[PDB]
Scaffold this active site. Structure first.
Site, PDB file in Angstrom:
ATOM      1  N   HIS A 144      62.823   1.091  -8.374  1.00 52.04           N
ATOM      2  CA  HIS A 144      63.209   0.491  -9.644  1.00 52.04           C
ATOM      3  C   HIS A 144      62.450   1.060 -10.839  1.00 52.04           C
ATOM      4  CE1 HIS A 144      65.175  -3.000  -7.668  1.00 52.04           C
ATOM      5  NE2 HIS A 144      64.243  -2.802  -6.753  1.00 52.04           N
ATOM      6  N   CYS A 177      59.328   6.409 -10.157  1.00 53.44           N
ATOM      7  CA  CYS A 177      59.147   5.180 -10.882  1.00 53.44           C
ATOM      8  C   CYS A 177      57.845   5.232 -11.646  1.00 53.44           C
ATOM      9  CB  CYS A 177      59.238   3.980  -9.947  1.00 53.44           C
ATOM     10  SG  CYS A 177      58.117   4.075  -8.512  1.00 53.44           S
TER      11      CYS A 177
END
Lengths: 227, 224
Positions: A91, A133
């Site tokens: 994410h 990320c």
């Protein structure tokens, strides 16, 4: 010596495509993030299955059968396979622990597949696609291809309901060109598409530029498997 | 959308090929090292010149006039150019200072050519070829080519130059004006990694390139 030499892609099986979802240490799970992740995973599952890969997905939420699945690709024989793919999904903005955990996980994953430890992939393309990320992306070896959603500087668009720009663009190219174009030409198309995209959003003018790093020694094609 | 799109290489000039020799802080200039270095420099000068480039060489021994030459590419307009090449040459094993200095120099050089600082190369291929030395962030349309990997293994300099530079130059000479440049670099990966040396030295060298290019790149003969 032959400028058009390509990897032999005539084995019984295409090989495994491991899709690894980095989820532990994440807890801002907003709906865009959760829906985007599964979308990216689904999208990649279809594209790689269509290219002949045996797709295996898993995540790191449970820290016991992760090693299982890990160990488990460690000891799998790839004698009958063309190649190996591993996709690392994560994410976009995470805390420092989530980001630091990614780095260790990527260092571990790549380390397993070095010629030194996986004789049955010696001389075969080992492809890693890393969705990086933000809070150690330095891996290599002969016949490795490392793909990065964004280079070390940089700006990456957040996850949306339909997934991430880089994954969507990658999968669009795979579906349309996967079975015909040389793989690094295809990744170059992915550079262009992603870097051409743009964000009412609140940071404009910004671009995400993907990067790939090749230690491949031959051209790579995913022609439809068998005749 | 066009899978075969390529960079426009139809400007007045190919562009500059800067060949930078990292010499300061090196000790122990053996003859192999000194003769290898000039061989690699000569080899690259001929290959790039033949591809249309305006070759500029310099080193860091002196140059109070290094910054000169530095600033000097900083402010050059590349409006009439296809692209920009910079090759960073260094000696194969060096002390920690020599190696650390190479890192700063490379960080500085690449920094100068970022779209943010060089408007006349925006959307043009910026190609850095780096002979790494033992004791990586770029920008749109950068292509970074590395003699080795990360840390790894690299063969020492010989009288005839280094394996990576020799093999690069051989490919440039034979295929430079026709093959897509990352295809050529891939051939270089193969050639170098196929070479073998002997003392403690039983392994390989594997080169690497990292691409942020968005289009195919060719160096077809510029039509005068």
């Amino acid at each position: 010596f032959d400028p058009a030499e390509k990897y032999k892609m005539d084995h019984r099986r295409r090989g495994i495509a491991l899709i690894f979802n980095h989820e532990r240490f994440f807890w801002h799970l907003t709906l865009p993030e959760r829906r985007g992740t599964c979308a990216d995973r689904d999208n990649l599952t279809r594209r790689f299955s269509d290219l002949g890969f045996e797709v295996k997905c898993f995540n790191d939420l449970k820290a016991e059968e992760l090693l299982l699945k890990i160990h488990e690709v460690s000891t799998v024989s790839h004698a009958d396979a063309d190649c190996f793919v591993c996709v690392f999904l994560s994410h976009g903005e995470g805390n420092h622990i989530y980001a630091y955990d990614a780095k260790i996980e990527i260092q571990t994953l790549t380390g397993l597949f070095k010629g030194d430890k996986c004789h049955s992939l010696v001389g075969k393309p080992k492809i890693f696609i890393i969705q990086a990320c933000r809070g150690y992306t330095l891996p290599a070896g002969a016949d490795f291809l490392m793909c990065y959603s964004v280079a070390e500087g940089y700006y990456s668009h957040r996850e949306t309901v339909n997934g991430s720009w880089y994954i969507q663009d990658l999968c669009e190219m795979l579906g349309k060109y996967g079975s015909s174009l040389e793989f690094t030409e295809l990744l170059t198309l992915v550079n262009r598409k992603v870097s051409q995209r743009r964000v009412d959003p609140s940071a404009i003018g910004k671009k995400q530029v993907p990067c790939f790093a090749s230690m491949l020694t031959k051209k790579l094609h995913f022609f439809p498997k068998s005749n």
